[PDB]
Amino acid sequence: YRLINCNTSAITQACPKVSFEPIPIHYCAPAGFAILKCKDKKFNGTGPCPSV
Amino acid sequence: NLWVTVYYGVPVWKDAETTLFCASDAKKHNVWATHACVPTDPNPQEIHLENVTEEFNMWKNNMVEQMHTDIISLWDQSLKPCVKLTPLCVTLQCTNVTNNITDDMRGELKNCSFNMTTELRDKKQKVYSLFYRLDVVQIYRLINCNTSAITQACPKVSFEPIPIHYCAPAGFAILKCKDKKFNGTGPCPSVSTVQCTHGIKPVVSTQLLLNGSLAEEEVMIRSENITNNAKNILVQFNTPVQINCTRPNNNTRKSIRIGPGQWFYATGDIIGDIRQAHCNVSKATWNETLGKVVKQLRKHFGNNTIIRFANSSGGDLEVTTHSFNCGGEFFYCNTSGLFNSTWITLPCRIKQIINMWQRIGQAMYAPPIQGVIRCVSNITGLILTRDGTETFRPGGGDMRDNWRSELYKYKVVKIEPLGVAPTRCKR
Amino acid sequence: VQLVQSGGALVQPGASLRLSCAASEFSFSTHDMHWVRQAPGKGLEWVSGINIHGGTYYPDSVKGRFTISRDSAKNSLYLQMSSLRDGDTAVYFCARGGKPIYYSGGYPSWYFDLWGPGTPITISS
Amino acid sequence: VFLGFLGAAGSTMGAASMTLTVQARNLLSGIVQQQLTVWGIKQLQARVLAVERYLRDQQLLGIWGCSGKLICCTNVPWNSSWSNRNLSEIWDNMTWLQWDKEISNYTQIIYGLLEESQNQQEKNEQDLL
Amino acid sequence: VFLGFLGAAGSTMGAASMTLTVQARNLLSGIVQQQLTVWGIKQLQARVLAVERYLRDQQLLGIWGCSGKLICCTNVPWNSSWSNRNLSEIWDNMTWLQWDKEISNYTQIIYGLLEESQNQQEKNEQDLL
Amino acid sequence: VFLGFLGAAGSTMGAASMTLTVQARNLLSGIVQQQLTVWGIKQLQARVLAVERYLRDQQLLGIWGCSGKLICCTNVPWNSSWSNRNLSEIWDNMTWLQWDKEISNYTQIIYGLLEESQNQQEKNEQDLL
Amino acid sequence: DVVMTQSPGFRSVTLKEKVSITCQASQTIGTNLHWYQQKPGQSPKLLIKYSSQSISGVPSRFSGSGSGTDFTLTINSLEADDAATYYCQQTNSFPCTFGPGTKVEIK
Ligand SMILES: *[C@@H]1O[C@H](CO)[C@@H](O[C@@H]2O[C@H](CO)[C@@H](O[C@@H]3O[C@H](CO)[C@@H](O)[C@H](O[C@H]4O[C@H](CO)[C@@H](O)[C@H](O)[C@@H]4O[C@H]4O[C@H](CO)[C@@H](O)[C@H](O)[C@@H]4O)[C@@H]3O)[C@H](O)[C@H]2NC(C)=O)[C@H](O)[C@H]1NC(C)=O
Ligand SMILES: *[C@@H]1O[C@H](CO)[C@@H](O[C@@H]2O[C@H](CO)[C@@H](O[C@@H]3O[C@H](CO[C@H]4O[C@H](CO)[C@@H](O)[C@H](O)[C@@H]4O)[C@@H](O)[C@H](O[C@H]4O[C@H](CO)[C@@H](O)[C@H](O)[C@@H]4O)[C@@H]3O)[C@H](O)[C@H]2NC(C)=O)[C@H](O)[C@H]1NC(C)=O
Ligand SMILES: *[C@@H]1O[C@H](CO)[C@@H](O[C@@H]2O[C@H](CO)[C@@H](O)[C@H](O)[C@H]2NC(C)=O)[C@H](O)[C@H]1NC(C)=O
Ligand SMILES: *[C@@H]1O[C@H](CO)[C@@H](O[C@@H]2O[C@H](CO)[C@@H](O)[C@H](O)[C@H]2NC(C)=O)[C@H](O)[C@H]1NC(C)=O
Ligand SMILES: *[C@@H]1O[C@H](CO)[C@@H](O[C@@H]2O[C@H](CO)[C@@H](O)[C@H](O)[C@H]2NC(C)=O)[C@H](O)[C@H]1NC(C)=O
Ligand SMILES: *[C@@H]1O[C@H](CO)[C@@H](O[C@@H]2O[C@H](CO)[C@@H](O)[C@H](O)[C@H]2NC(C)=O)[C@H](O)[C@H]1NC(C)=O
Ligand SMILES: *[C@@H]1O[C@H](CO)[C@@H](O[C@@H]2O[C@H](CO)[C@@H](O)[C@H](O)[C@H]2NC(C)=O)[C@H](O)[C@H]1NC(C)=O
Ligand SMILES: *[C@@H]1O[C@H](CO)[C@@H](O[C@@H]2O[C@H](CO)[C@@H](O)[C@H](O)[C@H]2NC(C)=O)[C@H](O)[C@H]1NC(C)=O
Ligand SMILES: *[C@@H]1O[C@H](CO)[C@@H](O[C@@H]2O[C@H](CO)[C@@H](O)[C@H](O)[C@H]2NC(C)=O)[C@H](O)[C@H]1NC(C)=O
Ligand SMILES: *[C@@H]1O[C@H](CO)[C@@H](O[C@@H]2O[C@H](CO)[C@@H](O)[C@H](O)[C@H]2NC(C)=O)[C@H](O)[C@H]1NC(C)=O
Ligand SMILES: *[C@@H]1O[C@H](CO)[C@@H](O[C@@H]2O[C@H](CO)[C@@H](O)[C@H](O)[C@H]2NC(C)=O)[C@H](O)[C@H]1NC(C)=O
Ligand SMILES: *[C@@H]1O[C@H](CO)[C@@H](O[C@@H]2O[C@H](CO)[C@@H](O)[C@H](O)[C@H]2NC(C)=O)[C@H](O)[C@H]1NC(C)=O
Ligand SMILES: *[C@@H]1O[C@H](CO)[C@@H](O[C@@H]2O[C@H](CO)[C@@H](O)[C@H](O)[C@H]2NC(C)=O)[C@H](O)[C@H]1NC(C)=O
Ligand SMILES: *[C@@H]1O[C@H](CO)[C@@H](O)[C@H](O)[C@H]1NC(C)=O
Ligand SMILES: *[C@@H]1O[C@H](CO)[C@@H](O)[C@H](O)[C@H]1NC(C)=O
Ligand SMILES: *[C@@H]1O[C@H](CO)[C@@H](O)[C@H](O)[C@H]1NC(C)=O
Ligand SMILES: *[C@@H]1O[C@H](CO)[C@@H](O)[C@H](O)[C@H]1NC(C)=O
Ligand SMILES: *[C@@H]1O[C@H](CO)[C@@H](O)[C@H](O)[C@H]1NC(C)=O
Ligand SMILES: *[C@@H]1O[C@H](CO)[C@@H](O)[C@H](O)[C@H]1NC(C)=O
Ligand SMILES: *[C@@H]1O[C@H](CO)[C@@H](O)[C@H](O)[C@H]1NC(C)=O
Ligand SMILES: *[C@@H]1O[C@H](CO)[C@@H](O)[C@H](O)[C@H]1NC(C)=O
Ligand SMILES: *[C@@H]1O[C@H](CO)[C@@H](O)[C@H](O)[C@H]1NC(C)=O
Ligand SMILES: *[C@@H]1O[C@H](CO)[C@@H](O)[C@H](O)[C@H]1NC(C)=O
Ligand SMILES: *[C@@H]1O[C@H](CO)[C@@H](O)[C@H](O)[C@H]1NC(C)=O
Ligand SMILES: *[C@@H]1O[C@H](CO)[C@@H](O)[C@H](O)[C@H]1NC(C)=O
Ligand SMILES: *[C@@H]1O[C@H](CO)[C@@H](O)[C@H](O)[C@H]1NC(C)=O
């Protein structure tokens, strides 16, 4: 037998102290920019949004 | 009863050394393609200046050093993340190729076998490739094995001679000299200011300058010092001459797995008869350009002085031959048949391990190329040295002079908009 | 609107001559003005020009022999030529520089919107 | 905006002074401002330095009380030792390049005397209320 | 300072003009300005670009002779070809978003005419002494 | 230009106010501005941040209608709750360091009232034409 | 210098034909090319500016385009009144220059 990816590419080992926990990340605008949030109820993803 | 008045936006400048930025041609892994400069095009930003005679000196132009510095940096960045052929620095068992080989190719091709690694770290494989003698040493071994690391150029990376334009950063401007028959230094009575330069192709060659610009009227001959035999002389033709170079011997390559995600490209057997690489020059135009050069050399050396052209004597390939790069293959052609005259078939050799800039090795290992190569270039210039009747020979120099020969028309200065003068106005 | 021009002339080689134009229904003070000449069998060679601030431009083919000037008070333009040659035989014209696409200061656009009728000069023995 | 720029330098200081905005409008944006950190970092460095140069000149004008406008009267008298030419001689026969060389020796002296705007501001407060 | 900002856009140009500082005070600091070169380099690049944008607008106002204040009278007449509405019609019934679209076609023309401040400065020197 | 700088701090606010340009002239250039991306990147980051700090203060002065000059009268009355000293007492017996501490509590309040310059600009347009 | 050429030397055309002539530069001039016409005994007139811009006073049947080193002038439907020698001028690089002209004869 063989490891299945041996003939294709390099294999590593994830660092044991590194944990990719799904921590929520927030995003903000840089200066000169602003973010518009659509509050339209039952918005289907496109077009005019009367409440922003 | 005069007063100090401060003026802002004053059109004055001083010489300065700054970084110039490149610009791209729009219209895709052709080196410059990754390290894109962002496309420009509608930028004929040229303004004629009246009077303001200014001086230029092409041998003191710092732009040359930048071109050298960044092209070499980019070369390494493009080729760094490739294979690293550690496993090929092994003993070779070589024999002669016994196929239908002409006389001019005897001893040129070796058939060598060796023990190569595999993707599975338990086993070895028997692999063979053809090699050219210039890259192989009899103890056999690869010739650079005992000196430094060898890699394999990435097969999808192509260092095409794409013209690059340069532009000033804010606060700077470029002065272009339009003086006809300018010899490279001193006052230039006709100058314009530009945003950017024209494009220059990053062509690296020896002896003859290919695919550059042409002189406007006369063949120009210039050097830092005309009478210094320790200096290289730059000759720019007003007429292009074509050179036709070919590489015969239709071939293929083999993709050999050498490790877990690593591949080596081997040279396969030649299809058909085996012949040497060579270049064609039209004798009629070669004779004309040398005569034109002599007519101009006589201006400084005497028109009653016999001028002879002679061979590029020196100690190595990078010194004595004409270096070309076509199809990704590196050629070292014999020009002794050109510089033979007192006032055309040129055989040629090839290599895969190229040092380029000496340093420590680099050894990109030009991969084998399948099929055949046909390449036609424009001879636009020549570099000569004199030995002192006088004799000239193909000269030397770094790639720096393959930039200087085009960069000589441009200089960069720093804008200094604030200053004072007396007026009759008091606050 | 037009450029009113003087009549033609015959002079000997080495002679000097002054040409002039005038602004009909406009001010010269608002435009860059140029002179061109049309030799028989030729197109229009630019000869000289003056900007709105009095700065000037000349070809090397006439520089040192030709001088351009303006007097806005009378809406007139002048071209003063010295040491004329037979080779300078041409129809001389004044032309009003065409409006530029974006402000340049006293730097001409080098194309023309308004052309005068033409004033021939013959230089011969 | 190379519609016109340093071509002003071909004429006299007087004439050139009528087109000062022609150069000012071309001082903040190089080609890299119109548009693997290797190599690309140089563009970032250049943009930053261009900003610094601009601001240093603006700060100097601010300090002198000359922030705003192209031409600023200072209320500082011109020294007779700085040059010996008729006022009209320099404005009609000299270019700015020539002038800058002629009085280069006094650059720091002149600027040091523009500190007088500070005394003027103190006087103005006292009599302003 | 999102105490108030682009909400001004919900009303007319006239009304919005009374709160211009509300937006100006929010133009120089993004979240990264309040607060391994990999990834982090982007924050550096963004801060630099924000500065460049700010300065370019300030430079333009400087050139026009409108540096300082929120509202600048130019002494350049409005062209009849640019719009055909009563002055009060645009100030009371239009928003700034609508207005910007309506006269977008003349942006460069209008700015080019603001170069006239240079002629005004030359005239002012001559009659000022 | 350490010919003189923060030594002004040794005296009273009144005296110190006569040398404000002494510090202003030293705010835009650190040693790195007079003069392998590893380590060197820090110099680039520092230059950028210095620029940002400078501009933020200039923007604030712009908003208040105090851009230009060292001393700006605001037309906003001083509150009796902010301090209880004779005007001459603070100018002759206090230093700026002491003063800054004494009224630190009112920094935001005072700045918020400098928004009044916006109302002044609207009034000025209406009566200016 | 910018050397400008024109081709053909002259063109033989007939009425209501859609026609064209071209101009070339020895070096790129961007889009800084202008078209002029002249009739015998007449002063010059400018018809097209900056490669493709129209000019008031020029009939809509005249148009053209180009960039770099290659430019074209065309007439949608040739009129008798269009007989003229047509010329190109470049304003990209000082000295300003012009081509030899193409004569258009109408039959
Ligand atoms: C002076 O100027 C002249 C003129 O420009 C230069 O010579 C030209 O050089 C180019 C490049 O060498 C050459 O163009 C090639 O023409 C071939 C004709 O068939 C093409 O096949 C070839 O394209 C392949 O190679 C390219 C290399 O980067 C690839 O990018 C391209 O996608 C093609 O490769 C694909 O297809 C092959 C098929 O087998 C495949 O194996 C590859 O993996 C890939 O899939 C080029 O288009 C011009 O024809 C040359 N012209 C002349 C007159 O020689 C000259 O080199 C310049 N001199 C100097 C000193 O710079
Ligand atoms: C590049 O280098 C060239 C070469 O030196 C410069 O060209 C010279 O520029 C100067 C400055 O403009 C020119 O001098 C001017 O000449 C005008 C000609 O007037 C003639 O006609 C009147 C009619 O009554 C006569 O009285 C007079 O004597 C002449 O015969 C003058 O009118 C100008 O003077 C005006 O301004 C001065 C300012 O103080 C006033 O005092 C005067 O009263 C008057 O208003 C001035 O003398 C010179 O002729 C140019 N030479 C040529 C060959 O053109 C270029 O200027 C320089 N660069 C650029 C960009 O131009
Ligand atoms: C590595 O080996 C595996 C095993 O042979 C290769 O994957 C097989 O490819 C064949 C092709 O027809 C398929 O029929 C098999 O089902 C595949 N195996 C599996 C487990 O799916 C794989 O492609 C090899 N990788 C490389 C780079 O050669
Ligand atoms: C959200 O709902 C709206 C309303 O039905 C959709 O808008 C229609 O989209 C079609 C797409 O061609 C148009 O032809 C109609 O004219 C649109 N209606 C109106 C009133 O304009 C919209 O596409 C929906 N979006 C999604 C993502 O579903
Ligand atoms: C280089 O040597 C190899 C090894 O002998 C040659 O390949 C052999 O060619 C014979 C021809 O009939 C075959 O039967 C063998 O099976 C081949 N061996 C291998 C390992 O492929 C190869 O042709 C030689 N190349 C040259 C140019 O001489
Ligand atoms: C690969 O390695 C093997 C092992 O060293 C080489 O073959 C040996 O050659 C020596 C020479 O005297 C013999 O004594 C051994 O018995 C050989 N071993 C075997 C297994 O045959 C082999 O030649 C190497 N191959 C290449 C291509 O270099
Ligand atoms: C690698 O080996 C080669 C071969 O021996 C060395 O180059 C030789 O150096 C001797 C020194 O006198 C010369 O005479 C030979 O002509 C050289 N060989 C060739 C092919 O030119 C080379 O220097 C060695 N490299 C290192 C790092 O030791
Ligand atoms: C270009 O031509 C000029 C004119 O001959 C050369 O200028 C001379 O250079 C020598 C060098 O010592 C001086 O002694 C002469 O006085 C210079 N002549 C003048 C008129 O000043 C210039 O060196 C040439 N440059 C090149 C690169 O050949
Ligand atoms: C150009 O080269 C010539 C020749 O080498 C230089 O002239 C020589 O200068 C050295 C300096 O000590 C003298 O000893 C030689 O006698 C000079 N040779 C002659 C023939 O006079 C010349 O100086 C170089 N030009 C420059 C500018 O350095
Ligand atoms: C240079 O030109 C010669 C002459 O055409 C080329 O060699 C010829 O190649 C053809 C091909 O079938 C032969 O029939 C001729 O007999 C050859 N002539 C000679 C004199 O050998 C030559 O290959 C060309 N070289 C290059 C680099 O293009
Ligand atoms: C090109 O090939 C020729 C082949 O003859 C080489 O000629 C030799 O040149 C040296 C130069 O001094 C002479 O000493 C030899 O006697 C020449 N050989 C013969 C057989 O006469 C020439 O050097 C080669 N040039 C290059 C650049 O490779
Ligand atoms: C350089 O030129 C000489 C002179 O023409 C060449 O030598 C001649 O070669 C022909 C070839 O048949 C002989 O017949 C002549 O007798 C030779 N002349 C002499 C003086 O020996 C020489 O081969 C040329 N060199 C190169 C590299 O082409
Ligand atoms: C050498 O330079 C000449 C001059 O530019 C090239 O020939 C021209 O190529 C352009 C390309 O569109 C053609 O339009 C011109 O008509 C060509 N001129 C001539 C006289 O044919 C030539 O192709 C270049 N040669 C090489 C090998 O690069
Ligand atoms: C190839 O043949 C040449 C002929 O002299 C000989 O010198 C050389 O050693 C041979 N090489 C091999 C590997 O057999
Ligand atoms: C190069 O090839 C072209 C192909 O037509 C040919 O015309 C030209 O003469 C050749 N050049 C030389 C030097 O033989
Ligand atoms: C070289 O040609 C020039 C041309 O005028 C001439 O004056 C000079 O004397 C000639 N020199 C010799 C050595 O014949
Ligand atoms: C090389 O030989 C193969 C054999 O079939 C042929 O298909 C291929 O086209 C040849 N290549 C060249 C460049 O002649
Ligand atoms: C000029 O310098 C001299 C030097 O002693 C000085 O006395 C004089 O007051 C200075 N000022 C002026 C305007 O001349
Ligand atoms: C003013 O001009 C005259 C002209 O000759 C000159 O003699 C006098 O010295 C000038 N004044 C100055 C300060 O140069
Ligand atoms: C001061 O004047 C002297 C006079 O020769 C000059 O050499 C020196 O460079 C001048 N300094 C400056 C700043 O111009
Ligand atoms: C408006 O544009 C027209 C276009 O011809 C122009 O004539 C007029 O002077 C311009 N200015 C104003 C304020 O109407
Ligand atoms: C002013 O308002 C009236 C209202 O109907 C309108 O008819 C008139 O055209 C308006 N003026 C302009 C410039 O629109
Ligand atoms: C100019 O007006 C036309 C009218 O349809 C419009 O399409 C075009 O986008 C306008 N240009 C600008 C800058 O708004
Ligand atoms: C000071 O604060 C008090 C708090 O009520 C306020 O009533 C008064 O108007 C404020 N202003 C001044 C200048 O005292
Ligand atoms: C003014 O100074 C006198 C000195 O004793 C003091 O009593 C009085 O309260 C002071 N006024 C203020 C506002 O402190
Ligand atoms: C406000 O005053 C209190 C009084 O003790 C003090 O502790 C607090 O730090 C002050 N806030 C500021 C901003 O100075």
Residue numbers in the entry:
A (entry chain C): 191 to 242
B (entry chain A): 33 to 59, 65 to 141, 150 to 184, 191 to 309, 312 to 323, 323A, 324 to 395, 414 to 458, ...
C (entry chain H): 2 to 82, 82A, 82B, 82C, 83 to 100, 100A, 100B, 100C, ...
D (entry chain B), E (entry chain E), F (entry chain F): 518 to 552, 568 to 661
G (entry chain L): 1 to 107
Quote the study's own text:
The HIV-1 envelope glycoprotein (Env) is the sole target for neutralizing antibody (NAb) responses. The development and structural determination of soluble native-like Env trimer mimics, particularly ones based on the SOSIP technology, has provided a platform for structure-based immunogen design. Here, we describe a detailed characterization of neutralizing and non-neutralizing mAbs isolated from two rhesus macaques (RMs) previously immunized with the BG505 SOSIP.664 trimer. We therefore selected three Fabs (RM20J, RM20F, and RM20E1) that bound to different epitopes for high-resolution structural determination.
For a more detailed view of the mode of RM20F recognition, we solved a 2.2 Å crystal structure of unliganded RM20F Fab and a 4.3 Å cryoEM structure of RM20F Fab bound to BG505 SOSIP trimer. RM20F recognizes an epitope spanning two gp41 protomers and a single gp120 protomer that has 1126 Å2 of BSA at the interface. The RM20F LC contributes 22% of the paratope surface area (250 Å2) and makes contact with the poorly conserved residues H85 (8.1% prevalence among global strains) and K229 (12.5% prevalence) in the C1 and C2 regions of gp120 respectively. The RM20F HC contributes the remaining 78% of the paratope surface area (876 Å2) and uses its 20 residue CDR-H3 to wedge between the FP of the primary gp41 protomer and the HR2 helix of the adjacent gp41 protomer. Additional contacts with the fusion peptide proximal region (FPPR) of the primary gp41 protomer are made by residues at the tip of CDR-H2. The N88 glycan accounts for 18% (198 Å2) of the epitope BSA and makes contact with the CDR-H2 and FR-H3 regions of RM20F. The lack of connecting density, even at lower contour, between RM20F and the glycans at N611 and N637 suggests these glycans do not substantially contribute to the epitope. Epitope mapping using BG505.T332N mutant pseudoviruses showed that knocking out the N611 glycan (N611Q mutant) substantially enhanced neutralization by RM20F, while knocking out the N637 glycan (N637Q mutant) had no effect. Other virus mutants revealed that neutralization by RM20F was sensitive to various sequence changes within the epitope, particularly at residues H85 and E647 (84.3% prevalence) and N88 (N88 glycan knock out). In comparison to the FP-targeting bNAbs VRC34 and ACS202, RM20F lacked neutralization breadth when tested against a panel of multiple heterologous viruses likely due to the dependency on poorly conserved residues, such as 85 and 229.
